[PDB]
Write a protein that binds this DNA or RNA. Structure first.
Ligand SMILES: [Mg+2]
Ligand SMILES: [Mg+2]
Ligand SMILES: [Mg+2]
Ligand SMILES: [Mg+2]
Ligand SMILES: [Mg+2]
Ligand SMILES: [Mg+2]
Ligand SMILES: [Mg+2]
Ligand SMILES: [Mg+2]
Ligand SMILES: [Mg+2]
Ligand SMILES: [Mg+2]
Ligand SMILES: [Mg+2]
Ligand SMILES: [Mg+2]
Ligand SMILES: [Mg+2]
Ligand SMILES: [Mg+2]
Ligand SMILES: [Mg+2]
Ligand SMILES: [Mg+2]
Ligand SMILES: [Mg+2]
Ligand SMILES: [Mg+2]
Ligand SMILES: [Mg+2]
Ligand SMILES: [Mg+2]
Ligand SMILES: [Mg+2]
Ligand SMILES: [Mg+2]
Ligand SMILES: [Mg+2]
Ligand SMILES: [Mg+2]
Ligand SMILES: [Mg+2]
Ligand SMILES: [Mg+2]
Ligand SMILES: [Mg+2]
Ligand SMILES: [Mg+2]
Ligand SMILES: [Mg+2]
Ligand SMILES: [Mg+2]
Ligand SMILES: [Mg+2]
Ligand SMILES: [Mg+2]
Ligand SMILES: [Mg+2]
Ligand SMILES: [Mg+2]
Ligand SMILES: [Mg+2]
Ligand SMILES: [Mg+2]
Ligand SMILES: [Mg+2]
Ligand SMILES: [Mg+2]
Ligand SMILES: [Mg+2]
Ligand SMILES: [Mg+2]
Ligand SMILES: [Mg+2]
Ligand SMILES: [Mg+2]
Ligand SMILES: [Mg+2]
Ligand SMILES: [Mg+2]
Ligand SMILES: [Mg+2]
Ligand SMILES: [Mg+2]
Ligand SMILES: [Mg+2]
Ligand SMILES: [Mg+2]
Ligand SMILES: [Mg+2]
Ligand SMILES: [Mg+2]
Ligand SMILES: [Mg+2]
Ligand SMILES: [Mg+2]
Ligand SMILES: [Mg+2]
Ligand SMILES: [Mg+2]
Ligand SMILES: [Mg+2]
Ligand SMILES: [Mg+2]
Ligand SMILES: [Mg+2]
Ligand SMILES: [Mg+2]
Ligand SMILES: [Mg+2]
Ligand SMILES: [Mg+2]
Ligand SMILES: [Mg+2]
Lengths: 185, 159, 58, 48, 172
RNA sequence: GGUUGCGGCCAUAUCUACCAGAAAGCACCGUUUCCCGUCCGAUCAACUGUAGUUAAGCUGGUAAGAGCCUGACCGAGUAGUGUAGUGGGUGACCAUACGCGAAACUCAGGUGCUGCAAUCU
RNA sequence: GAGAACAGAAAUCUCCAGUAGAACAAAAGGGUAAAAGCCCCCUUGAUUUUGAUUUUCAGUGUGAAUACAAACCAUGAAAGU
RNA sequence: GCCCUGAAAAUGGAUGGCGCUCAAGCGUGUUACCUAUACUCUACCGUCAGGGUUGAUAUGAUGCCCUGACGAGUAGGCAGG
RNA sequence: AAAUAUGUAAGAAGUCCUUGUUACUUAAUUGAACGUGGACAUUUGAAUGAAGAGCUUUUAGUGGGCCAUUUUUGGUAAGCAGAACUGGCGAUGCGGGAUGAACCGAACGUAGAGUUAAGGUGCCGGAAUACACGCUCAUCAGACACCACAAAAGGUGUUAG
RNA sequence: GGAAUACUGCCAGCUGGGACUGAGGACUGCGACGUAAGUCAAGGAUGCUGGCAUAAUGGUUAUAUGCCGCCCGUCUUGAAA
RNA sequence: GAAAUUGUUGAAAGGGAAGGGCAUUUGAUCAGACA
């Protein structure tokens, strides 16, 4: 027998492929696992894994968040990479040139980018221009902005938003929510 | 029925030490505490105000707040399968500066010495601590010391 | 209809599956419950030294 | 480093046997456990 | 507890600054191997001195061999033992050819006559009785009468096979 | 070294009985107009430092002193205890193995150390 | 304990010893001696605001309590409380 | 110490049974020997892990190849069928 | 005043130098708190191990428990009732204890060879009617832990003291 | 005085009998032996010979013999009850 | 035109149930592979 000291037969817990059933997605994965095995470039390992990500773990990057990054010191000529979709944002008025490589560009993102004489690029066009991902700036979007996580960790004094349907006074705002009605949270 | 009030089971715990009752000597009051200090906790029964709960007796924590008559000590208490942070408000009579740190603090300064001290000569240091090693060989003489032979002794009563 | 009243039996087995999680420790802990007079001042002090680095980048 | 490098040795049961009717007393009481000092070699060899 | 050897074991309390050269005490110990023998040593020292093995060292261990292993000898033996309801001193006489052989039969005897296991006995002294007539126990004296002779009646041959064709004879 | 004012550790400083204390200090000590408190100027307040005294306080020394403090292979590797056995025993209980290890006892040695400031044959 | 008319076992007076052998509403246990007890003097902080904390705990509530902030006061020569 | 007395219950009956007495009994010692789904080595299944391999011109890239370790299971969860 | 248990510590989130910020705090540019600039690297600060560590969501069953050693309350006691720590049974077969939930041994993929555990080796039954020293004779001998019970008290049976 | 022997330990000293296994499928490695050519027991069995070519070996099935095997489902701390 | 259940025929076993597991003998039966 063996005094084991960890669960036997334990799966690593990381996606290994995507869960997506999409040919093209599966082809990009063909590309980057090859790239990952045969170059020592860290960039390719990162990108591989990101393609596995499910939709939640791929929040959209906005074109304004893109612009912000290019304002980094020594970064305006970097080619930014988003492994996910890139959305448009009327809140910025002046958008720079650059080259963005992503899985998806919305109609208006592509427009904004292209109208500033930028360039929208797929991840595989990206691969051929930069096999070691040289000169690249990988941006991820905000994961914990999602409406769902408003309610994670609900409990007294945790300050975290009821799962509630209708809202207003008269919906979960009395006993336990104020000093004068039993107690507060 | 059962009884579980604040100072329950504490009869001997908060008692006062044989022939050590009365005023607390002024040095207790002259000592100084700074945020970050490490203190051991132990209740003075004669000081009822600002008193640690019995759980925290013999427990050691870090000072996080310094107030007019007291210090705030954070202690990590384990409840269930986990620790929670606890912040105590202790008066200075129930706290003392911990020595749990001197053999380190005094060793750090020491390390810095023989580090620079050696280095300047031309290195070869070794300043990690090492456990009791086993004994090396040795020769024991007999001179003035021939071995005395003992046996076991018969059973006997004396009573 | 009497029954077992109480026992710790098997409880530390349970506490130790997932582990007794050591406390977790941060640089910069909270100032929760630290003297408000101190904090009020500490606030302006920081305002001050920050100013004097923006200033040192003129 | 040297000794961690070696996997734990996986031995068989002693081929001679254990020399004792009952293993789970100390070596000193005609049993098998504890420090048996240099007599460890005869065991290990019979188990190796 | 086994087939005995006899050891000199020598030990002392560990040295100190204010006391280098501690005193040095020896015991003769009957045990089957040196591990049991050094253990027995500490056992008995801790009934005599402020020591334990954690604060002492064995200085020497040395097996003592019988001086005349083929000279028959009358041994006086002194023992302390524990019974079920009390503890007790005893004197036995054993006749064999080595202290070692002597001690093996003692433990045997103590086990058989008194039900004393090895844990319950203390050899206090084992010594060769020089002149006869200080030999005191009859079951031995018997064997030192002049020109001693005796038959072994009722001889019992061991068979080698399950069937015999004769009918044995116990003659001798 | 003494002494004083303020101390730290709070009996090696306490307790009982004796004896010794130069110089300064402290003290006891004189007074009752004033502030002030009392049944009572004993305490407390003020005034003198003059009129008097080492008697007490105080400090120190003595004592096969009581207490306290320290040490010790003194007792004791004892009591107790963590771990082991298809060990003993009807049992109560007990021995052994690998470790940890007291208290009383007994004997010896002690009997305030010390900070800041002023002062003194 | 040793003393003083009526005065006795016990009334009121004085001196000596006195580590608490008393007293502090109450059960008990802790605590306390120029006090935490007893006598006297002045009082209303047993007040105002709203947070943090400890026990019980789910780290909910309630009860009780702790240390601060911001007021206004009390007492004391004062530090303070 | 062993043995004996002390020692009384219900269908006939249990050191497991037979039976055993310098034991096949009791205490103790020494060897040898028997045998678990356990230990050691090896093959094969499956699980988990770590590597390697898009290069046409032939057939599974969820593939193919190398390597290591692991495998009890009610209630219950998930997975591939 | 133990033993067993138990809090904290063994560094880069560390140590030392210089001297900025404030309304807090000091008699005071005093401190306090947070900082800028500078100096020292894997024997950087004990051992052993680490099929890695951290983190998030959501949901099942469960919420009658029972047993063993040790500690332990009530009770004359109980295969009784109740707690402490661990280990088990429940949920688990396998070898041993004849038999048996919980004891001993040992935890399970399908198999070959070997060696063992606990326990055995007259015959049932695989395995010495092996060796060795004693003791024991029972007209109700005795025979292996848990375990399937025996006591006070007696013997000029016999043994050794 | 001078040896021998026992005991314990060591040898990268030699050597006999017996059992199970033979996974892998060009080469590729680390070596060993040779002056060399070459050889080898060095990253997993080949050589030589015989018998049958069929129910012979093997499957299936009935039976017999050794040892083993209680009635499932259920609630239950605990079910063959 | 299933099964429970039944008649006949054939074969087999059966000292207070029967059925089951590992293994082989015996009988009956059968696949494959050889050139
Ligand atoms: Mg929103
Ligand atoms: Mg909304
Ligand atoms: Mg109670
Ligand atoms: Mg109060
Ligand atoms: Mg009920
Ligand atoms: Mg019940
Ligand atoms: Mg219940
Ligand atoms: Mg062998
Ligand atoms: Mg064998
Ligand atoms: Mg052999
Ligand atoms: Mg046995
Ligand atoms: Mg072997
Ligand atoms: Mg001799
Ligand atoms: Mg004078
Ligand atoms: Mg006067
Ligand atoms: Mg006055
Ligand atoms: Mg005088
Ligand atoms: Mg004295
Ligand atoms: Mg113990
Ligand atoms: Mg026992
Ligand atoms: Mg005892
Ligand atoms: Mg009280
Ligand atoms: Mg006072
Ligand atoms: Mg009120
Ligand atoms: Mg509630
Ligand atoms: Mg509360
Ligand atoms: Mg019987
Ligand atoms: Mg039998
Ligand atoms: Mg026997
Ligand atoms: Mg197997
Ligand atoms: Mg294996
Ligand atoms: Mg399974
Ligand atoms: Mg610990
Ligand atoms: Mg390691
Ligand atoms: Mg790892
Ligand atoms: Mg759940
Ligand atoms: Mg649940
Ligand atoms: Mg529930
Ligand atoms: Mg157990
Ligand atoms: Mg159940
Ligand atoms: Mg089991
Ligand atoms: Mg069985
Ligand atoms: Mg039985
Ligand atoms: Mg039979
Ligand atoms: Mg046989
Ligand atoms: Mg034999
Ligand atoms: Mg027993
Ligand atoms: Mg008798
Ligand atoms: Mg092959
Ligand atoms: Mg092959
Ligand atoms: Mg033919
Ligand atoms: Mg055919
Ligand atoms: Mg044929
Ligand atoms: Mg059949
Ligand atoms: Mg059967
Ligand atoms: Mg049912
Ligand atoms: Mg029932
Ligand atoms: Mg029944
Ligand atoms: Mg029809
Ligand atoms: Mg048939
Ligand atoms: Mg068959």
């Amino acid at each position: 027998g063996i005094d084991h000291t960890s669960k036997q037969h334990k799966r690593s817990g990381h996606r290994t492929a995507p869960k997506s059933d999409n040919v093209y997605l599966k082809l990009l994965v063909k590309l980057y696992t090859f790239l990952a095995r045969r170059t020592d470039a860290p960039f390719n390992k990162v990108v591989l894994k990101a393609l596995f990500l499910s939709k939640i773990n791929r929040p959209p990057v906005s074109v304004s968040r893109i612009a912000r990054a290019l304002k980094q010191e020594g970064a305006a000529n970097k080619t930014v990479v988003v492994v996910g979709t890139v959305t448009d944002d009327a809140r910025i008025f002046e958008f720079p040139k650059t080259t963005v490589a992503a899985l998806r560009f919305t109609a208006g993102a592509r427009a904004k980018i292209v109208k500033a004489g930028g360039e929208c690029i797929t991840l595989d066009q990206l691969a051929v221009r930069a096999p070691k991902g040289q000169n690249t700036l990988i941006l991820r979007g905000p994961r914990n902005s999602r409406e769902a996580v408003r309610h994670f960790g609900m409990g007294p004094h945790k300050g975290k938003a009821p799962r509630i349907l209708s809202t207003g006074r008269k919906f979960e705002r009395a006993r336990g929510r104020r000093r004068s009605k039993g107690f507060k949270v | 029925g059962k009884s579980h009030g604040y100072r329950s089971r504490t009869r001997y715990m908060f008692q006062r030490d044989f022939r050590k009752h009365g005023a607390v000597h002024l040095s207790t009051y002259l000592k100084v505490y700074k945020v970050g200090d490490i203190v051991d906790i132990k209740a003075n029964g004669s000081i009822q105000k600002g008193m640690p709960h019995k759980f925290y007796q013999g427990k050691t924590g870090v000072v996080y707040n310094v107030t007019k008559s007291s210090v705030g000590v954070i202690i990590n208490k384990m409840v269930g399968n986990r620790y929670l942070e606890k912040r105590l408000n202790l008066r200075v009579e129930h706290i003392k500066h911990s020595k749990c740190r001197q053999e380190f603090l005094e060793r750090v300064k020491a390390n810095a010495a023989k580090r620079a001290e050696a280095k300047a000569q031309g290195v070869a240091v070794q300043l990690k601590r090492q456990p009791a090693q086993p004994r090396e060989s040795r020769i024991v003489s007999t001179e003035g010391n021939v071995p005395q032979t003992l046996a076991p002794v018969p059973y006997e009563t004396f009573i | 209809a009497k029954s077992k009243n109480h026992t710790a039996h098997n409880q530390t087995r349970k506490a130790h599956r997932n582990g007794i999680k050591k406390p977790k420790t941060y640089k910069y802990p909270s100032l929760k419950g630290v003297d408000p007079k101190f904090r009020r001042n500490h606030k302006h002090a920081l305002h001050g030294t920050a100013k004097a680095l923006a200033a040192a980048k003129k | 480093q040297a000794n961690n490098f070696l996997w734990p040795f996986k031995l068989s049961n002693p081929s001679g046997g254990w020399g004792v009717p009952r293993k789970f007393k100390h070596f000193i009481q005609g049993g098998s456990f504890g420090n048996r000092e240099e007599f460890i070699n005869k065991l290990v060899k019979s188990m190796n | 507890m086994a087939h005995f050897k006899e050891y000199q074991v020598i030990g002392r309390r560990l040295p100190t600054e204010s006391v280098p050269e501690p005193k040095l005490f020896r015991m003769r110990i009957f045990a089957s191997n040196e591990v049991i023998a050094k253990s027995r040593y500490w056992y008995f020292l801790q009934k005599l001195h402020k020591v334990k093995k954690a604060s002492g060292e064995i200085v020497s261990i040395n097996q003592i061999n019988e001086a005349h292993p083929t000279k028959v000898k009358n041994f006086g033996v002194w023992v302390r033992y524990d019974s079920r309801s009390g503890t007790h001193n005893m004197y036995k006489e054993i006749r064999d050819v080595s202290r070692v052989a002597a001690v093996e039969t003692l433990y045997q005897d103590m086990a058989a006559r008194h039900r004393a296991r090895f844990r319950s006995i203390h050899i206090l002294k084992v010594a060769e009785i020089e002149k006869t007539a200080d030999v005191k126990r009859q079951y031995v004296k018997q064997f030192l009468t002049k020109d001693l002779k005796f038959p072994l009646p009722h001889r019992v041959q061991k068979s080698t096979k399950t069937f015999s064709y004769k009918r044995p004879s116990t003659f001798y």
